[PDB]
Amino acid sequence: DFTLRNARMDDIDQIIKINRLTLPENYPYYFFVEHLKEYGLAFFVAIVDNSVVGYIMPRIEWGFSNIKQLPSLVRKGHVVSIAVLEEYRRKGIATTLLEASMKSMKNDYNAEEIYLEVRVSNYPAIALYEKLNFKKVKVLKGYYADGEDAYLMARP
Numbered sequence: 001d002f003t004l005r006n007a008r009m010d011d012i013d014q015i016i017k018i019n020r021l022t023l024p025e026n027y028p029y030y031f032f033v034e035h036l037k038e039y040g041l042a043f044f045v046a047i048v049d050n051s052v053v054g055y056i057m058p059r060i061e062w063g064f065s066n067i068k069q070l071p072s073l074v075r076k077g078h079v080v081s082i083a084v085l086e087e088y089r090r091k092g093i094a095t096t097l098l099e100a101s102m103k104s105m106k107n108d109y110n111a112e113e114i115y116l117e118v119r120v121s122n123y124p125a126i127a128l129y130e131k132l133n134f135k136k137v138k139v140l141k142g143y144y145a146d147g148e149d150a151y152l153m154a155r156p
């Protein structure tokens with residue numbers, strides 16, 4: 001089984017290692033640090049045997065809604081990055097990380113809606129998000145480097 005706690009500065013080495021093994025968007029270390037500094041309460045790691053096997057990196061934003069029809073300014077949570085090491089997948093880790101991060105986005109940071117972007121080919125993640133009541137809002141054409149479309153997904 002696994003446990004969740006808030007990420008700490010000394011987790012970043014392991015967070016970056018997971019990021020680089022699992023995802024092509026390889027953000028600089030300082031990028032991870034900025035999110036930990038500003039939105040840390042909603043930045044979680046999953047722990048198995050005193051090591052990090054998963055994380056969720058959040059951002060809290062203010063701007064136009066991705067959900068309302070008429071332009072509408074809101075406080076919104078943004079899932080920037082989420083990953084689980086291969087060996088530890090399908091154990092409910094990402095679900096747990098997401099539920100924990102979303103709680104904090106709303107309760108610590110006053111987020112009113114939550115959104116993310118995902119590769120249209122990333123069926124495991126799309127399935128995860130739809131389980132947690134995210135809906136496809138629109139296709140961001142050619143969002144990824146090389147040209148892959150993203151779904152913008154958002155949750156009221």
Ligand SMILES: CC(C)(COP(=O)(O)OP(=O)(O)OC[C@H]1O[C@@H](n2cnc3c(N)ncnc32)[C@H](O)[C@@H]1OP(=O)(O)O)[C@@H](O)C(=O)NCCC(=O)NCCS
Pocket residue numbers: 022023082083084085088089090091092093094095096117118119122123124125127128129131
């Ligand atoms: C997407 C990812 C974070 C899922 O992590 P996870 O801990 O394995 O997810 P969970 O175990 O909580 O799964 C929750 C739901 O996700 C879906 N899912 C996860 N992996 C799946 C897969 N291999 N095939 C089909 N559905 C999958 C299922 O609907 C699952 O619900 P269920 O098993 O009860 O039916 C993980 O596969 C991953 O680390 N991928 C690489 C990084 C990445 O793509 N992150 C997202 C970028 S936007």
Ligand SMILES: [Cl-]
Pocket residue numbers: 144145146147148
């Ligand atoms: Cl691409």
